[PDB]
Amino acid sequence: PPYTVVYFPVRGRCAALRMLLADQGQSWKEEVVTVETWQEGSLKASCLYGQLPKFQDGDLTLYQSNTILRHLGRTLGLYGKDQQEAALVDMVNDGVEDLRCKYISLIYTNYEAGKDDYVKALPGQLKPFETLLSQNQGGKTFIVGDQISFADYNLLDLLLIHEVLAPGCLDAFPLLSAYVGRLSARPKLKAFLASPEYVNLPINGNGKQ
Amino acid sequence: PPYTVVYFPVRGRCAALRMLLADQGQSWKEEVVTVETWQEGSLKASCLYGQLPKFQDGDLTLYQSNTILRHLGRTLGLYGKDQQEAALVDMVNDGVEDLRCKYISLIYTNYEAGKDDYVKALPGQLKPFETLLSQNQGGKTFIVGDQISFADYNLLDLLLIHEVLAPGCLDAFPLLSAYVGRLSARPKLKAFLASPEYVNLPINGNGKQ
Numbered sequence: 032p033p034y035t036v037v038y039f040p041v042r043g044r045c046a047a048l049r050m051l052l053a054d055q056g057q058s059w060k061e062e063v064v065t066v067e068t069w070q071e072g073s074l075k076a077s078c079l080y081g082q083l084p085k086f087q088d089g090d091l092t093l094y095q096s097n098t099i100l101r102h103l104g105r106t107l108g109l110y111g112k113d114q115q116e117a118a119l120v121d122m123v124n125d126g127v128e129d130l131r132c133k134y135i136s137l138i139y140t141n142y143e144a145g146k147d148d149y150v151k152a153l154p155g156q157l158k159p160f161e162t163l164l165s166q167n168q169g170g171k172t173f174i175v176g177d178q179i180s181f182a183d184y185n186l187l188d189l190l191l192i193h194e195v196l197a198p199g200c201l202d203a204f205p206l207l208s209a210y211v212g213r214l215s216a217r218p219k220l221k222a223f224l225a226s227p228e229y230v231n232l233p234i235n236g237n238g239k240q
Numbered sequence: 241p242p243y244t245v246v247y248f249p250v251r252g253r254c255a256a257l258r259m260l261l262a263d264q265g266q267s268w269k270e271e272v273v274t275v276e277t278w279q280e281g282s283l284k285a286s287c288l289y290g291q292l293p294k295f296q297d298g299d300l301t302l303y304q305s306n307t308i309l310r311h312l313g314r315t316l317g318l319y320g321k322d323q324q325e326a327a328l329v330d331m332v333n334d335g336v337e338d339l340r341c342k343y344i345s346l347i348y349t350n351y352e353a354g355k356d357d358y359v360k361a362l363p364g365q366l367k368p369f370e371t372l373l374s375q376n377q378g379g380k381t382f383i384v385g386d387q388i389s390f391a392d393y394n395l396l397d398l399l400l401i402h403e404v405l406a407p408g409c410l411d412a413f414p415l416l417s418a419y420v421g422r423l424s425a426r427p428k429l430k431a432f433l434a435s436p437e438y439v440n441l442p443i444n445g446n447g448k449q
């Protein structure tokens with residue numbers, strides 16, 4: 032395949048780009064990195080910012096999950112119909128990234144002490160996405176415009192992982208709820224989400240979710 | 241088109257997009273938001289993620305500093321010559337954002353206890369940008385390709401505030417040192433960087449730097 036994903040055996044920051052590739056019917060290869068290979072040090076030292084994912088599209092080598100999402104969005108026509116929609120797509124993705132960083136901090140950094148406070152604050156963090164939906168054709172299509180964008184896949188992932196963290200958190204958000212059901216039912220996406228290559232990976236690297 | 245930036249009287253997350261506008265010969269309006277006005281609550285409630293900057297470009301309203309940078313980059317032709325360069329631009333900008341996040345956490349959250357460890361870890365955080373410069377026409381031009389991008393303005397800001405935090409932090413990095421000097425000397429940028437509207441604003445909102 033022309034695309035290669037180099038990552039740990041986890042969903043994590045590669046979940047959204049994999050859904051994207053799967054739902055767009057694109058071929059890719061997974062190169063899996065074990066704790067042992069990572070602790071050896073040489074791969075890590077070769078990575079631009081000492082981190083995975085690493086991504087290859089022929090001889091173009093990329094780092095940073097949002098860089099990969101933008102690159103696939105650009106090349107696969109999932110980045111708005113014009114320059115205005117492209118900006119709105121970015122605004123969504125930035126908000127998605129912001130909550131993801133808070134999620135990651137909780138998971139890896141203080142799950143036991145921090146979880147109750149995090150869940151109390153969750154609805155205030157989810158509301159901007161409901162608002163965005165309410166303002167785009169009554170929330171019945173995508174997060175921006177009338178075609179799917181890389182931000183939809185990233186937002187969808189963020190909502191799925193939060194329903195695992197806080198079951199029922201979308202009960203307060205009818206548009207986000209319907210949106211999850213709707214995108215998850217796209218046939219290629221539905222098949223990928225049900226498959227062992229997705230189901231048999233943990234969400235995170237430390238066994239918390 | 242016309243442009244408006246709504247923000248606190250600080251450089252912070254608006255410094256890079258202001259440098260972009262100035263260097264590109266663009267005109268803009270500053271709407272300054274005081275501590276008192278922000279604490280009142282109504283502006284904040286009206287902001288998509290309850291954060292500034294808020295940006296207006298004619299009828300288009302944007303939030304999130306990197307969304308504003310990409311929008312200005314897209315519409316003004318500061319986003320690489322092709323898809324490969326656009327992707328590398330994003331990769332640089334995401335890396336700048338990551339280190340910016342750490343800087344902000346230090347400044348607002350942990351300045352006294354945390355600064356020594358932060359400064360000790362700094363060279364390893366700067367090395368990737370030196371490397372990227374080394375791989376692009378010997379570091380003689382821009383961070384990506386041979387035309388300026390929005391990532392150059394963001395990286396330049398990151399470098400300037402870090403020289404304030406850790407004087408001499410670029411001395412081991414010849415390409416970065418020369419890049420800062422060279423970009424800073426661009427006539428419109430030089431003029432803006434010397435102006436009271438930049439010089440007389442603090443870097444951050446809490447008086448630390």
Ligand SMILES: O=C(O)CCCc1ccc(N(CCCl)CCCl)cc1
Nearest residue numbers: 248249250252253275344444445446
């Ligand atoms: O944008 C960034 O860099 C992140 C920090 C943004 C920020 C800047 C200033 C203030 N205040 C000063 C108002 Cl004059 C409130 C006191 Cl801290 C609050 C937040």
Ligand SMILES: [Cl-]
Nearest residue numbers: 042043044135
């Ligand atoms: Cl992750």
